[PDB]
Coordinates of C-alpha atoms and ligand atoms in Angstrom, one line a residue:
Chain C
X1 CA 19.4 -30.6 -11.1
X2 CA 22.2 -28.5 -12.0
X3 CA 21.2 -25.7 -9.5
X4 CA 19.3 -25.5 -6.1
X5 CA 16.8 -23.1 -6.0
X6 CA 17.4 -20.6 -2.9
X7 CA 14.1 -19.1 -1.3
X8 CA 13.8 -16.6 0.7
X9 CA 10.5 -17.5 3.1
X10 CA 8.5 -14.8 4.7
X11 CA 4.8 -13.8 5.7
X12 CA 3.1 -11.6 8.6
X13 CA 1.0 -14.2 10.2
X14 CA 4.4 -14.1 12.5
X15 CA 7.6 -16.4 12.4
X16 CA 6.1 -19.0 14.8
X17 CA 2.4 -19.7 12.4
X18 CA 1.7 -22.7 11.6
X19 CA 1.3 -21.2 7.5
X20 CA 5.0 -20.4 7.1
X21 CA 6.0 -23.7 8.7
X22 CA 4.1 -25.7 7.0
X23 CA 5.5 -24.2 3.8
X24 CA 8.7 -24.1 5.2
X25 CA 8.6 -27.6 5.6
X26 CA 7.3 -28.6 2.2
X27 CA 10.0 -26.4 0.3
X28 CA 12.8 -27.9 2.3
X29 CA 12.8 -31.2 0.3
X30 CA 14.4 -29.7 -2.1
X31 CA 14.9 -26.1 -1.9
X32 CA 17.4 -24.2 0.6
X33 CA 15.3 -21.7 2.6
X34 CA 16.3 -19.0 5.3
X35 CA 12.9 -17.9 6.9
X36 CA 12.9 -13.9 7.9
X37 CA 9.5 -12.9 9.4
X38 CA 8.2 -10.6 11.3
X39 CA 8.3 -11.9 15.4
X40 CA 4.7 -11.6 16.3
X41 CA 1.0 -11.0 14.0
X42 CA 1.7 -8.4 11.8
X43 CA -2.0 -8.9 9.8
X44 CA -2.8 -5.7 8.0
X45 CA 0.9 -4.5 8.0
X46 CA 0.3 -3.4 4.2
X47 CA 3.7 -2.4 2.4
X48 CA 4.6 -0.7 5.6
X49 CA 8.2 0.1 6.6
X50 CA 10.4 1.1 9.8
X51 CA 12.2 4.1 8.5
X52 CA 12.2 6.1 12.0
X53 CA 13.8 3.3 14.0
X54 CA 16.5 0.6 13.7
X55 CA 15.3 -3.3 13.9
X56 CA 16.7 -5.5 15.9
X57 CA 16.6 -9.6 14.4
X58 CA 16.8 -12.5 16.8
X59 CA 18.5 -15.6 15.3
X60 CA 16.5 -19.0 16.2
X61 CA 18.0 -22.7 16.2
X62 CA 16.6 -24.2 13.4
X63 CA 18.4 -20.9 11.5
X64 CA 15.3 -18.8 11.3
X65 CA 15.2 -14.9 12.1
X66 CA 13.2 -13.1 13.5
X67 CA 12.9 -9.5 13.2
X68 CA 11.5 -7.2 15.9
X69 CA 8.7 -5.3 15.8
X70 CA 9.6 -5.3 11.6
X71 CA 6.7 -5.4 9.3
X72 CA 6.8 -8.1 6.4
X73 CA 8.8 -5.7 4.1
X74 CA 11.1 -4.6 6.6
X75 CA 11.7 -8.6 7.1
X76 CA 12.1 -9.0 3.0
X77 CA 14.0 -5.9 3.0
X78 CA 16.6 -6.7 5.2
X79 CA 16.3 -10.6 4.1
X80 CA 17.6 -9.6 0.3
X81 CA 19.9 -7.0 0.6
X82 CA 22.0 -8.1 4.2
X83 CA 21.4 -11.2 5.5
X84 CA 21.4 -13.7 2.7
X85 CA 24.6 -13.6 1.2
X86 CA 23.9 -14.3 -2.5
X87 CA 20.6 -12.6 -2.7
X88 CA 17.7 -15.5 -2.6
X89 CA 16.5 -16.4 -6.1
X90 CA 13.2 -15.7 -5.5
X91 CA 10.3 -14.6 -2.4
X92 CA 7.8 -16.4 -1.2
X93 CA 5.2 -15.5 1.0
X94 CA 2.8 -17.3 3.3
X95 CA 1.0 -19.7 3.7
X96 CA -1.3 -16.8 5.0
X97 CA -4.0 -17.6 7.5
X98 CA -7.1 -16.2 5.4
X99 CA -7.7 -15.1 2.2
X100 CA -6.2 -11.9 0.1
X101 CA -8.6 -11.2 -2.3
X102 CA -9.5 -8.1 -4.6
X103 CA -9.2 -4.5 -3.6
X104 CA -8.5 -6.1 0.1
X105 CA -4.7 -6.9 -1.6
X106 CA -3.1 -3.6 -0.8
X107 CA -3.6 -3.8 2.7
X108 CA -1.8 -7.4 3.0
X109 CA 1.4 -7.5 4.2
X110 CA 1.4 -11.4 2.7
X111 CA 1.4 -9.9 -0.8
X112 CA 3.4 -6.9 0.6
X113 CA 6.7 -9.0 1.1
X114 CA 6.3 -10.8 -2.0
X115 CA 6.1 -7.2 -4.0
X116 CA 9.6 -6.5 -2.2
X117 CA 11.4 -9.4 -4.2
X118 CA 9.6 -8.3 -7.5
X119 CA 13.1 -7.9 -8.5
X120 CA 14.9 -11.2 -8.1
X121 CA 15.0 -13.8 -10.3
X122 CA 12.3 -15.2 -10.3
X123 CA 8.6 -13.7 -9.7
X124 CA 7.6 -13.4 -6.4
X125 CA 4.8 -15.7 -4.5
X126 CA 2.0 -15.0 -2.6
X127 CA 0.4 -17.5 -0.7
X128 CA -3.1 -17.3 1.0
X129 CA -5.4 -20.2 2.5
X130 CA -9.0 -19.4 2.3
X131 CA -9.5 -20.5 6.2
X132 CA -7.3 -22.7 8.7
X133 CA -8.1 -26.8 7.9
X134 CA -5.6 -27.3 4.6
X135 CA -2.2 -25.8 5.1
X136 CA -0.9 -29.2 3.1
X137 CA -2.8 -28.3 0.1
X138 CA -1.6 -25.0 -0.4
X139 CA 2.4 -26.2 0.3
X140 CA 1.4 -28.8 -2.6
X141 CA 0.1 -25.8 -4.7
X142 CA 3.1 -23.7 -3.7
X143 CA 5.5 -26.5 -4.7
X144 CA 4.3 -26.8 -8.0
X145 CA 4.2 -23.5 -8.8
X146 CA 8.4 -23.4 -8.2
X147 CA 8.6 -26.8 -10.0
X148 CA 6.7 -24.8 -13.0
X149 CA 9.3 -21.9 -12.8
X150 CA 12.2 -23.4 -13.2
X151 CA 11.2 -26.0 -15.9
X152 CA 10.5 -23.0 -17.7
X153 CA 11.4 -19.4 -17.3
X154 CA 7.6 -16.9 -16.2
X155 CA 8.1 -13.9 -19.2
X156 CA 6.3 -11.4 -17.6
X157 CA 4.5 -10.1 -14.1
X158 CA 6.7 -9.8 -11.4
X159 CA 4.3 -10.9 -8.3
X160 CA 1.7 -13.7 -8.5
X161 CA -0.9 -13.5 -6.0
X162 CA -2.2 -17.1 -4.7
X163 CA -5.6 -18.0 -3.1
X164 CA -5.5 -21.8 -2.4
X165 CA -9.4 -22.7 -1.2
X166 CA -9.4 -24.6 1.9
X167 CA -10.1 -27.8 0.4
X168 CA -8.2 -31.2 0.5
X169 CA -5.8 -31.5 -2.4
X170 CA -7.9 -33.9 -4.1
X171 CA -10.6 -31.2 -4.0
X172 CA -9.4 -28.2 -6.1
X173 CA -10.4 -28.6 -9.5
X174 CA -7.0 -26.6 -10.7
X175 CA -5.6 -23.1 -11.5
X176 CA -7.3 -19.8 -12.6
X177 CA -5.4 -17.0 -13.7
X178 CA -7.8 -14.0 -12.9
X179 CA -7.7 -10.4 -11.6
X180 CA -8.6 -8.8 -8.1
X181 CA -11.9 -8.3 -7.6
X182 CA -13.8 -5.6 -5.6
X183 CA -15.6 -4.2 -2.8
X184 CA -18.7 -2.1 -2.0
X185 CA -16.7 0.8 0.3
X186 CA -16.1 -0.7 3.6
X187 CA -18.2 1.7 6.7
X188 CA -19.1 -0.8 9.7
X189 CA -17.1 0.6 12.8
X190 CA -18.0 -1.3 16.3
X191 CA -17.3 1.5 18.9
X192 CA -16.7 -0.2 22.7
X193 CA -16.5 2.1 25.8
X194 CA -13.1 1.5 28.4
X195 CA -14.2 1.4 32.0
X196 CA -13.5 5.0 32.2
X197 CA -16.8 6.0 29.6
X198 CA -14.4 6.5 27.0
X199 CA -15.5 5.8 23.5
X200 CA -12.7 3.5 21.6
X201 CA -13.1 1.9 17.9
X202 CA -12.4 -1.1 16.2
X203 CA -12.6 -1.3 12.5
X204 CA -14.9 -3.4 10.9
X205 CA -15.5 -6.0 8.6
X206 CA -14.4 -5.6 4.9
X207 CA -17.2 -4.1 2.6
X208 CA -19.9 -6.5 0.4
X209 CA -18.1 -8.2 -2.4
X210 CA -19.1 -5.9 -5.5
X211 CA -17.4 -7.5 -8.6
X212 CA -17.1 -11.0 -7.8
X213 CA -17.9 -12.1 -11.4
X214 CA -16.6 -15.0 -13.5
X215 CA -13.3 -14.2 -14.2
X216 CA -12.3 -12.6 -10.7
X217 CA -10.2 -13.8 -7.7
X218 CA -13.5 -13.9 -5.3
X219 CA -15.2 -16.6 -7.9
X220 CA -11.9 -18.8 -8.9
X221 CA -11.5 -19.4 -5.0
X222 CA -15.8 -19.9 -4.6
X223 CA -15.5 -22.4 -7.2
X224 CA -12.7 -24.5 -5.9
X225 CA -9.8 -23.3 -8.6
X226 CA -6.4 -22.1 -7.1
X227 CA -6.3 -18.5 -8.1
X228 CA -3.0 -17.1 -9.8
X229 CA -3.9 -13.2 -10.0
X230 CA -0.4 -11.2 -11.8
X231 CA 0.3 -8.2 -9.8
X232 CA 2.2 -4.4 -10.6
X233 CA 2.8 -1.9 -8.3
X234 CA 2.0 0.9 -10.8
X235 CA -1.1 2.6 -9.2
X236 CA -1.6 5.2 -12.0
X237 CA -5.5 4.9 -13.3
X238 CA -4.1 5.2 -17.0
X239 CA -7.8 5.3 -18.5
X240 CA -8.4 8.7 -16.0
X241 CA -5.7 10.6 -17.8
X242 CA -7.3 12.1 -20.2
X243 CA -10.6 13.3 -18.1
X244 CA -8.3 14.5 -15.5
X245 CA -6.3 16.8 -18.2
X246 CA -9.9 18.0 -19.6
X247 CA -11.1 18.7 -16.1
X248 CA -8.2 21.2 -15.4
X249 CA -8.8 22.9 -18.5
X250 CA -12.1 23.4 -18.1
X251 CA -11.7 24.7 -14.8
X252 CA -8.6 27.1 -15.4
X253 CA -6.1 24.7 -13.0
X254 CA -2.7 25.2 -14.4
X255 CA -3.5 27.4 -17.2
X256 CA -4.2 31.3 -17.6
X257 CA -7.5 30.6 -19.8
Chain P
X1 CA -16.6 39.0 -5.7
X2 CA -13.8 36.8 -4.0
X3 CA -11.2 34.4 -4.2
X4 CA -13.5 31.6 -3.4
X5 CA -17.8 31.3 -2.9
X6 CA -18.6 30.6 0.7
X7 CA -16.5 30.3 3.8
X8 CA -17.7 26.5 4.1
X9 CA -18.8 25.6 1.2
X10 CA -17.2 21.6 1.8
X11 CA -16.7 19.2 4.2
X12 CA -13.2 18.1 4.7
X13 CA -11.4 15.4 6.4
X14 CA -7.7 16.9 6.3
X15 CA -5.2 14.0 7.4
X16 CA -1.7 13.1 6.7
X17 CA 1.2 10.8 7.4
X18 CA 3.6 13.4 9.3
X19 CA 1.1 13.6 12.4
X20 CA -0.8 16.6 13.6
X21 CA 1.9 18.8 14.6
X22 CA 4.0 18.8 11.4
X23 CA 3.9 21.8 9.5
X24 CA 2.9 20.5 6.3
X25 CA -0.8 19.6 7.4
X26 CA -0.7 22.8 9.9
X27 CA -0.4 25.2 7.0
X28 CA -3.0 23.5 4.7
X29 CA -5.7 23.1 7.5
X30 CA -5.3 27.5 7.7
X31 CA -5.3 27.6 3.8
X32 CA -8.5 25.5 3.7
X33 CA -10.1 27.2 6.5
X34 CA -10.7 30.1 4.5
X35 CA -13.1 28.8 2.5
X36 CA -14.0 25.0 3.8
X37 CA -14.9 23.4 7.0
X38 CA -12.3 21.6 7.8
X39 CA -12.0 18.3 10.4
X40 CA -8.5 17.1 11.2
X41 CA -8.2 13.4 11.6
X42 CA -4.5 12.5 11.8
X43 CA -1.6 10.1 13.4
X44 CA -0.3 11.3 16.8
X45 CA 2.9 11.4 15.7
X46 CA 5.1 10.6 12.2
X47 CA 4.0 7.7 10.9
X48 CA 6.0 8.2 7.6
X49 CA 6.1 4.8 5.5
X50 CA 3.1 3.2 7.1
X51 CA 1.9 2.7 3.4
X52 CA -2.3 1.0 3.6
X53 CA -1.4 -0.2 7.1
X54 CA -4.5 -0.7 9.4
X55 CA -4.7 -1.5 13.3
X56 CA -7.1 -4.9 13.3
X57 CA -6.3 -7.0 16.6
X58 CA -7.1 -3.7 18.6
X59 CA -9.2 -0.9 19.0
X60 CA -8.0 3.1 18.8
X61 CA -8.5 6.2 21.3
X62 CA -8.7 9.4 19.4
X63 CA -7.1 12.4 21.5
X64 CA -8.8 16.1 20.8
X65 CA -7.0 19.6 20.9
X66 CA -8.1 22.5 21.8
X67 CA -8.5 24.4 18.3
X68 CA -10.2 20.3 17.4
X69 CA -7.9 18.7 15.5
X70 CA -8.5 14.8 16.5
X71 CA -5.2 12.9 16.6
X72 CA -6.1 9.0 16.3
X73 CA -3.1 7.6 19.2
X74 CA -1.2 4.5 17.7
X75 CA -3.5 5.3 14.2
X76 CA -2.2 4.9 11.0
X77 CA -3.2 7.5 8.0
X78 CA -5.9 5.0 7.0
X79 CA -6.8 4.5 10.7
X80 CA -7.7 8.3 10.8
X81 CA -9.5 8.5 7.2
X82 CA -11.6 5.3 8.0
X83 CA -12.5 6.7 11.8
X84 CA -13.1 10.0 10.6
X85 CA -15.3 8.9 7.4
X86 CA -17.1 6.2 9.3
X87 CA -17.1 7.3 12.7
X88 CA -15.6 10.8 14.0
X89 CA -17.2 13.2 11.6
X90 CA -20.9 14.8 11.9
X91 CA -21.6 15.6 9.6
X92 CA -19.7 13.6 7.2
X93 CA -17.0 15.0 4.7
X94 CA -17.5 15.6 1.3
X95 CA -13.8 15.0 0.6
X96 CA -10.7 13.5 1.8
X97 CA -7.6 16.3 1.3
X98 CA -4.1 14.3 3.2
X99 CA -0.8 16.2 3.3
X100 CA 1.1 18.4 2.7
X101 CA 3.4 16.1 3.0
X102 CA 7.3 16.7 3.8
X103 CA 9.2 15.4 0.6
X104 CA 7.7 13.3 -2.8
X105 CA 5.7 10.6 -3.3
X106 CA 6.6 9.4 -6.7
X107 CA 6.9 6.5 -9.1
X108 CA 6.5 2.9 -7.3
X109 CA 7.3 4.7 -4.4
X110 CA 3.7 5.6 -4.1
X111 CA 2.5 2.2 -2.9
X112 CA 4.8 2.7 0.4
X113 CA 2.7 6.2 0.9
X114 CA 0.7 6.7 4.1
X115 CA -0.3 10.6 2.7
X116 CA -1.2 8.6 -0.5
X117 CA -2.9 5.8 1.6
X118 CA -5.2 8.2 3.4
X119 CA -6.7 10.1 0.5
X120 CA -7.0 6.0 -1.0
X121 CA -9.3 5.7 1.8
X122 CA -11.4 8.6 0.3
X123 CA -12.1 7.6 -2.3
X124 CA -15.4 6.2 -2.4
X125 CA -16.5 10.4 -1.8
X126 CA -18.2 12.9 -3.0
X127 CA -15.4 14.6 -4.4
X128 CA -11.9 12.6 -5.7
X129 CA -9.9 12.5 -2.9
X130 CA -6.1 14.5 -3.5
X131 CA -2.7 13.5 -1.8
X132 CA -0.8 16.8 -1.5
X133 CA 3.5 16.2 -1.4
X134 CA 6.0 18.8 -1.4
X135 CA 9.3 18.0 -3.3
X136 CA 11.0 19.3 -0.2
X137 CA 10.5 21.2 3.1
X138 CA 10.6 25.0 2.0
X139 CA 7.6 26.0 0.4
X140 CA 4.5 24.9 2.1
X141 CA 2.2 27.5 0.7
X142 CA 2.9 27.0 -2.8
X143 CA 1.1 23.1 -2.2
X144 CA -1.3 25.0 0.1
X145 CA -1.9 27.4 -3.3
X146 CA -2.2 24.6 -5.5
X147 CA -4.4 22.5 -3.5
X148 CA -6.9 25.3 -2.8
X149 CA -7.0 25.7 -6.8
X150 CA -7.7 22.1 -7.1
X151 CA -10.3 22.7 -4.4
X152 CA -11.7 25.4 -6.3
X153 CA -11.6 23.7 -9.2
X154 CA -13.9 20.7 -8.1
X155 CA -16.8 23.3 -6.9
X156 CA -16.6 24.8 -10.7
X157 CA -17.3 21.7 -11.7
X158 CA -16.8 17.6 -10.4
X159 CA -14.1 15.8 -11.6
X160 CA -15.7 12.4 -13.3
X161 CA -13.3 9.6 -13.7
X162 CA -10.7 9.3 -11.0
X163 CA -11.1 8.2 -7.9
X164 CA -8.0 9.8 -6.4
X165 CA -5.3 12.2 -7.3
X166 CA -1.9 12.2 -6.6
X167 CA -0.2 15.6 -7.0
X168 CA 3.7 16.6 -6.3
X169 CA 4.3 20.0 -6.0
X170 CA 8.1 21.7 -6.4
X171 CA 9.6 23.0 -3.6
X172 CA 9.7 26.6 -5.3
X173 CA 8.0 29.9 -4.8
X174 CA 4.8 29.8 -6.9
X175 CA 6.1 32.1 -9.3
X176 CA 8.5 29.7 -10.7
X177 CA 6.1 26.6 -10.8
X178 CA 5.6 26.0 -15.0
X179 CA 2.5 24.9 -14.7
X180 CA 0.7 21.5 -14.2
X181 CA 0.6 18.1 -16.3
X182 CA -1.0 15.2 -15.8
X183 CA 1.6 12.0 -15.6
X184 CA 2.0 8.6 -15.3
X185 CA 4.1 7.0 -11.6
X186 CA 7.8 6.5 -12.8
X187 CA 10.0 3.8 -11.6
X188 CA 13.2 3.2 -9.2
X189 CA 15.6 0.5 -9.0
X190 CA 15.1 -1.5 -6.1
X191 CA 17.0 -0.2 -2.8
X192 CA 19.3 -1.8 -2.0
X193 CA 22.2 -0.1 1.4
X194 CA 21.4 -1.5 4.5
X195 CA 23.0 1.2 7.3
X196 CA 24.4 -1.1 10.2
X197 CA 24.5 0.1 13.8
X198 CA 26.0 -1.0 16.9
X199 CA 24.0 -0.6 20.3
X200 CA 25.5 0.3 23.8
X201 CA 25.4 -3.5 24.5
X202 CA 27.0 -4.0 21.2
X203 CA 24.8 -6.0 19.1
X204 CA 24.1 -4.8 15.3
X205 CA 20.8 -3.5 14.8
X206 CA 20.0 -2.2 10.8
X207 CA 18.5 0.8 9.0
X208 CA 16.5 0.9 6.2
X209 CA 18.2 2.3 2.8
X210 CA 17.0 5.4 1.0
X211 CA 14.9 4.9 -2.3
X212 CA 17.2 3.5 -4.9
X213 CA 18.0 5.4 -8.3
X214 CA 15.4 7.0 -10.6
X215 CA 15.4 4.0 -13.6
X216 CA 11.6 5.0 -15.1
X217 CA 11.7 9.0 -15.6
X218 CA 10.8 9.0 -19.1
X219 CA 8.9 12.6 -20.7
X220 CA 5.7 11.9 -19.0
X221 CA 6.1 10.2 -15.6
X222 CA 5.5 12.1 -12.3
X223 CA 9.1 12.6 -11.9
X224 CA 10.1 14.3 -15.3
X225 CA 7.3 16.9 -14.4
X226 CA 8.5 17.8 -11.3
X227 CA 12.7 17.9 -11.9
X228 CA 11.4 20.3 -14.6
X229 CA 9.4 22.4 -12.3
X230 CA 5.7 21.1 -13.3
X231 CA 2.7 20.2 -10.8
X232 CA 2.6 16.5 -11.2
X233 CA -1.1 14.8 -10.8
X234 CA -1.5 10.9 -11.5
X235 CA -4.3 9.7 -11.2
X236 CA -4.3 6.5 -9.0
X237 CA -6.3 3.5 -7.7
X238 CA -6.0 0.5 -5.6
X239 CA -6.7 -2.5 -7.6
X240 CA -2.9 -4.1 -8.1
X241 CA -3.9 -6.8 -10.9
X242 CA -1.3 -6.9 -13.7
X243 CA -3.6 -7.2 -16.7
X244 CA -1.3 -7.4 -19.3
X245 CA 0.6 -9.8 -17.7
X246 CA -2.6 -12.1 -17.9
X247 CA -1.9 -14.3 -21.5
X248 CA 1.9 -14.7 -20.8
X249 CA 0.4 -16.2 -17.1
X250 CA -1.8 -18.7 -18.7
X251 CA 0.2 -19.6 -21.2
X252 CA 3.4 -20.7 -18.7
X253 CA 0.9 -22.4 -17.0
X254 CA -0.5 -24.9 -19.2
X255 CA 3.2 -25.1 -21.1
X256 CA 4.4 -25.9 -17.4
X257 CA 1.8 -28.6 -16.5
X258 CA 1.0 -26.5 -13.3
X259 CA -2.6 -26.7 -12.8
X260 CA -3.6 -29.8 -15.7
X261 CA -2.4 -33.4 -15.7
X262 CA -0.9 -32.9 -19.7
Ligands
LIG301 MG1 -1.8 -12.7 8.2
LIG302 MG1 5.5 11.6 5.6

């Protein structure tokens, strides 16, 4: 190999989670890695950033920092712009605890730090277990995946979002490349009193799966495949434009008549 | 005849990202009041940046004022929207209004939103949800007039397609705003200063950059309309899938040998 291939490993499961060691393991044989994460469970982080406060990083043995209290993109953020020196080639993230499936992928903070290296040299990864057993399989899926960009240069997408299903390796009957499925809107809250008769509330579990067909990230997963799911993060609803300019005419927003 | 038909003629769940007390969401919850019934659902402080964050490994207390705004403590934007849509709110809102808030949310910045986050949780409503952003901190009831247009608008007549709405307004007396147009998000080059800082004990502790250069502000974006004095609305959603990236995907794979034996 003419060139090593420089990774920058993160995730939000925490720095310590047995996910992003696992990985971080399997990518060392013949990768360099510096690990940045966040220091503790950061699940549902989201692209969310410290902007009101400085963060603090704690330096481990092994090389791997930490950083306080920062959320996955904070940890990317800081990762590729100060404290790898080059930048990394590329991002990985994971392996996440869980899946990250469908409309569910804006609130990850898993796909979150891979959509802060979209522009690197290489497209980001996102990496999910469906479940806890196989962490082996989806390093094995992961490790491909970089053997596959570099023997031959990904054109276009600048994230890809991977669901490994918590199967041994022998198990998974390959790759789909699909899109996010959906949900039915999410409305189960489970409100717990304190000791004090105060009423406090947790958030509840996701919403019904809605479009889970064939050709989605719910099914690819259900089925056994790996799924590879290209990501943007251009939110504009492009086929709304034109209903949305109508609408303001025909209500007199904007214009005098 | 007046201005608008009813004093509360909808239900709204008013939130934002700059807490309760910022002036932004103070000025639109009297706006709206004229004319809606109004529920305040917000963070109990600034929670700026918190993008689609949610609180999952605890549960929230909600703190009430005296005039009833609800401030969720520790919540995020989303926090408040899904409490207040799912929980708070008898009866429940016919629409999700979050902002105004304090500066733009444009181009791929959007993603990174928690104003824009909160009316994304709205959007399985009665009525599209809008997130209201001033392009500045001067003129709060220019965004105030042009939401309660919107607002007006949608009990002339519903707004089909589009789920949510994202709309920038100049920071300029109404007078001078152009007009409206409906864009597309623009782009930014990544950011990429890190502002180091020493402590008292003298260990370096880092901020977080600005938003790097405008690199997508091309005739229709979100960010040409404003600079040039328009009312920017995209319409957004949440799905992140990168379809036409789908072929060139596949393709890779199979020339790569990623995912077959040949
Ligand atoms: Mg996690
Ligand atoms: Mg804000």
């Amino acid at each position: 190999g003419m060139a090593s291939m420089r990774i920058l490993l993160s995730n939000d499961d925490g720095v310590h989670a047995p996910g992003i060691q696992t990985l971080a393991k399997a990518l060392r044989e013949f990768a360099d890695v510096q690990v940045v994460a966040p220091d503790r469970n950061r699940s549902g982080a989201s692209n969310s950033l410290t902007l009101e406060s400085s963060l603090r990083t704690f330096t481990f043995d092994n090389g791997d920092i930490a950083v306080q209290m920062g959320t996955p993109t904070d940890c990317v953020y800081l990762g590729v712009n100060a404290l790898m020196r080059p930048r990394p080639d590329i991002v990985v993230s994971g392996i996440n605890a869980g899946p990250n499936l469908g409309d569910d992928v804006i609130y990850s903070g898993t796909v979150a730090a891979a959509m802060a290296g979209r522009h690197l040299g290489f497209p980001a990864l996102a990496v999910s277990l469906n479940g806890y057993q196989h962490y082996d399989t989806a390093a094995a899926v992961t490790c491909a995946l970089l053997r596959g960009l570099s023997r031959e240069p990904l054109r276009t997408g600048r994230i890809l979002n991977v669901n490994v299903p918590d199967l041994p390796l022998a198990q998974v009957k390959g790759i789909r490349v699909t899109r996010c499925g959906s949900r039915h809107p999410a409305d189960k809250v489970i409100p717990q009193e304190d000791p004090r008769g105060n009423t406090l509330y947790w958030i509840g579990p996701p919403g019904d799966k809605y479009d889970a067909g064939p050709d989605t990230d719910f099914a690819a997963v259900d089925e056994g495949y790996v799924s590879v799911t290209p990501l943007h993060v251009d939110l504009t609803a492009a086929s709304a434009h034109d209903v949305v300019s109508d609408w303001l005419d025909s209500v007199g927003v904007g214009t005098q008549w």
